């Protein structure tokens, strides 16, 4: 079917520029237009710019004053937003959407998954997983066990976490991220099933942070303290 | 900065004629059709005439067709609405938009979903 | 004017009908471009939900309909799910700024959803963050509706205020709530006080759980 899938979340310092790509599938390319719309938080969407598919040719909303370029490769069946000189309100989702013609002005049938750019001076920062439990690591007590990692320290959002035994994936509950007083973000993954015993490795945290192309495992929770 | 700035609107007589132009500037391309819509008090802007500016191909409604002629002038870069034995039910605020989508134009000339750059309109009453 | 306005809430019970009002100016609806309707679940991309101010896509139930009036449009919900949970905007063109415009977004709240209890557990400092010279007690609340909760903690039989981080409540994909609060503490704190707890109030109850440092041995 219709299909538009962009390109990851980026984050950029600000005065730089961000290219998000958005490539098109199950359907004629060049017999479309693209638009792209943004999403700040707390805010409305606001359209950015059009770009016909086909010739090439470019409208940009006079909000953004040169600052947002459009280019498409139809080899490639993919539009390309450059947005230049960013300032914190660029921080926002980026969609793209396909205009489908309607005499009564075009519509945007098919939405891409959109494209998070973060604007911040902040430092680019890998997180900190630490092991936590509760019921400690061998209950003497019959108490159930609760695993959980302590995800610290990383900026900016955000991270992915999932759980493994062994090899199979494993039910989690996700929580919100809060920005720490230092600037800096936390968070934190439980593992859904309490547990009572466990071969050392059997469970693991598996928490990735593409912003700083980091992959951290925790895999062992040690004798409790 | 696409402007469209219409002028030659006033007021005539039934069976009077008047010259509508449309003075484009701030394309950064020239593949655009140019309508006219016109807008009567209590209604919405319906496509009177439209032009594709690299065709030539002009369209028409048919309550205009044979008293309106729509022309283009690419190195001036006006269109011009010539509008002849003009009756009181043509009275309304006249628009001048462009098409950026030529896909648009040639499946629907005469369309508001055709057109994303307008002008701000200029008003013509026709009495009686 | 040339911006489309929506309320920026409405909620409704189960079976029940709601309504979003999306006015615009003589600009956009007045010169005759119709209205578009956009449907944004929690962690989604928008959907084309009505167009041409009635019309219905493939894929649109009959709940939703739609009518415009030249300066005011409505999206009427009737029959209201829990799926139907979500922010919806409407859209479209205005002459005047001669490019295309949204409403502001209408979050819609189904209210009488059941409730539930939070599902409270309290973490001691991992021996890992300790040898880093830092100590951070986790209280992890999920599984919980409506989503406020208040969060309280105490050293010994103490209250603490500071170096506590507690996170807006907020949906996850499986419909409930979850929340966490953080009490950061120097390792010193952490050994000296004979116990640390989190109180967690939701709905005319509270649960409270409590750490130990010797409670593991
Ligand atoms: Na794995």
């Known amino acids: 079917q219709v299909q538009l899938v962009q390109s990851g979340a980026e984050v950029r310092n600000p005065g730089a520029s961000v290219k998000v790509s958005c490539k098109a599938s199950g359907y004629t390319f060049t017999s479309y237009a693209i638009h792209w719309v943004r999403q700040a938080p707390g805010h409305r969407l606001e359209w950015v710019g059009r770009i016909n598919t086909d010739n090439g040719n470019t409208k940009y909303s006079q909000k953004f004053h040169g600052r947002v370029a459009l280019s498409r490769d139809t080899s490639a069946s993919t539009t390309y937003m450059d947005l230049s000189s960013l300032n914190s309100e660029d921080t926002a989702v980026y969609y793209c959407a396909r205009a489908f013609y309607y005499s009564s002005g075009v519509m945007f049938d098919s939405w891409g998954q959109g494209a998070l750019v973060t604007v911040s001076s902040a430092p680019t920062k890998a997180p900190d997983v630490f092991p936590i439990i509760s019921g400690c690591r061998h209950p003497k007590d019959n108490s159930p066990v609760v695993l959980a990692c302590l995800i610290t320290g990383y900026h900016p959002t955000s991270v992915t976490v999932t759980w493994y035994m062994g090899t199979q994936s494993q039910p989690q509950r996700t929580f919100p991220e809060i920005q720490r007083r230092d600037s800096y973000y936390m968070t934190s993954s439980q593992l859904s099933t309490p547990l009572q015993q466990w071969r050392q490795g059997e469970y693991k945290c598996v928490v990735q942070h593409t912003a700083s192309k980091s992959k951290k495992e925790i895999f062992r929770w040690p004798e409790s303290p | 900065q696409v402007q469209l700035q219409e002028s030659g609107g006033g007021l005539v007589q039934a069976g009077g004629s008047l010259r509508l132009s449309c003075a484009a500037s701030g394309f950064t391309f020239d593949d655009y059709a140019i309508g006219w819509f016109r807008q009567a008090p209590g209604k919405e802007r319906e496509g009177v005439s439209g032009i594709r500016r690299s065709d030539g191909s002009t369209h028409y409604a048919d309550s205009v067709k044979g008293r309106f002629t729509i022309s283009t002038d690419n190195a001036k870069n006006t269109v011009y609405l010539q509008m002849n034995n003009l009756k009181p039910e043509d009275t309304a605020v006249y628009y001048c938009?462009?098409?950026?989508?030529?896909?648009?134009?040639?499946?629907?000339?005469?369309?508001?979903?055709?057109?994303?750059?307008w002008g701000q309109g200029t008003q013509v009453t026709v009495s009686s | 004017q040339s911006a489309l306005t929506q309320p920026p809430s409405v909620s409704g019970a189960p079976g029940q009908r709601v309504s979003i009002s999306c006015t615009g100016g003589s600009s956009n609806f007045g010169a005759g471009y119709d209205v578009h309707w956009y449907q944004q679940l929690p962690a989604t991309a928008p959907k084309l939900l009505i167009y041409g101010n009635n019309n219905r896509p493939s894929g649109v139930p009959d709940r939703f309909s739609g009518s415009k009036s030249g300066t005011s449009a409505s999206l009427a919900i009737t029959g209201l799910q829990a799926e139907d949970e979500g922010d919806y905007f409407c859209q479209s063109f205005d002459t005047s700024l001669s490019g295309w415009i949204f409403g502001g977004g209408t979050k819609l709240t189904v209210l009488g959803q059941p409730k539930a209890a939070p599902s409270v557990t309290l973490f001691p400092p991992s021996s890992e963050e300790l040898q880093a010279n830092k100590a951070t007690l986790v209280c992890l609340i999920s599984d919980f509706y409506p989503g406020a909760v208040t969060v309280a903690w105490k050293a010994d039989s103490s209250p603490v205020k500071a170096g506590v981080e507690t996170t807006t409540p907020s949906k996850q994909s499986n419909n409930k709530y979850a929340a966490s609060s953080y009490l950061s503490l120097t390792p010193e704190q952490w050994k000296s006080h004979r116990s640390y707890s989190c109180q967690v109030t939701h709905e005319g109850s509270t649960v409270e759980k409590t750490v130990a440092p010797t409670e593991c041995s």
């Open positions: 938009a462009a098409a950026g989508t030529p896909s648009y134009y040639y499946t629907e000339p005469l369309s508001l979903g055709t057109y994303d750059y």
